[PDB]
Amino acid sequence: SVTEFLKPRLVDIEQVSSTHAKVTLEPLERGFGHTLGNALRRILLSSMPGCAVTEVEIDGVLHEYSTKEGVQEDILEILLNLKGLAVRVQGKDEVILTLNKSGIGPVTAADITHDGDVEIVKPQHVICHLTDENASISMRIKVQRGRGYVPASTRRLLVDACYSPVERIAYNVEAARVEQRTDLDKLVIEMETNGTIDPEEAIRRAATILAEQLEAFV
Template sequence: MQNSPTEYLKPRIVNVEVINPVRARVTLEPMERGFGFTLGNALRRVLLSSIPGYAITEVKIDGVVHEYSTLDGVQEDVVDILLNLKGVALKLHNKSETILTLNKTVEGPVTAADFETNHDAEIINPNHLIAHLTKGGKLNLEVKVEMGRGYQPVPARRKSNQEDKTLGFIMVDASFSPINKVSYFVESARVEQRTDLDKLIMDVETNGVIDAEQAIRDAARILMGQLSVFANLESALTEVEVKQAPQVDPVLLRPVDDLELTVRSANCLKAENIYYIGDLIQRSENELLKAPNL
């Protein structure tokens, strides 16, 4: 129980319910009132945007110049093939990018299992459909798989990878996030006589590249890393240099009357708006000679 206003309850009961291989429901309780929504929303946003994953970013298909082409012997056009390739879930080991090839000449469906993988790449959903071949059809393609974070459309990636673009490859929008869906619920929890506590339930579904429980742990670590900066906040006041006004020679502030000029000369200077010695020294000799009656 809470002993002082500066102490906060921490979740003591953590239950992980595995619904299927790619979906799990995690329950944490008890939490102080309001913390369920605060942490649930923060975890959900991090899960959807910041968990790294892998995606096909470029595709090269034999006989295809652009994405609006068609292939003989293939039921789908190139646009449909590219859309289907985006749904392939992959995982790389010890690499941040690689090239995979697919060569199919047998009539029937073409699936992700037809990719020629090596020990560095793993296909998570081998039954994912890519295309259908009719009699005599063939499909030969290469794909570039990269590691990334979030969603990166082609225009944004084209600007940053202009020099690295491989000839013949078609760039595709890349969704690197391994998280398909996240939802959270907050219910009431009770500890002894306190009934105003929260219970947080996180429901996470992935594409199989990462399990839901590990995804929540990774999201929590990301949040902790970002918030640690605020926890270790130190005053970093820098001394502001005060600019001192330049020192002025007091002689320049003396009136021209102190120069013991004739009355006519003094009046002439004042007619030219010269009242102090500082005003006088700012005028050139030619300007003074042009002054009337001087």
């Protein structure tokens, strides 16, 4: 009568697509919605472990503001395309992938030569387009495991590291009514991931982490 609280009873999971999910809980005590939503957002944006590309070496170009012949996309566009690559690595902190292509065609993520450990979620992802038969492009990409977001400024071209699998988090709190009381909060959370892990799965991981942060006081 003094210690118990309103545990959520309805958990509604709506899947817009494979990587887009919307999760709803109700009811929660007055004010617990904001606390849980904020804790999950902060722990998701900058604490989820993951692997991503850090730096890339291209034999053709040695400077950021350079141009590669036969490729209408600039080096900056190449780095932006490399940013979104979704790679999962099993048991290795650092790996190097070497990519070679020649001829005319849009360079796909599948063109990378990878071992059993390295796996690419989206093979059809495009890096750059080749418009010349003579045009051949080869580079080396480095994938490392880390946490959160790492800018290139705080750091052979350097690329920002999107370690965290999650991409966008946004929560909202509505009013849900139980019998006479109405001030109880209903949390509706919305998330989208790059594709490495199931959207609703990620939340679980996040939750576990926060629980593991409180083992010394329970």
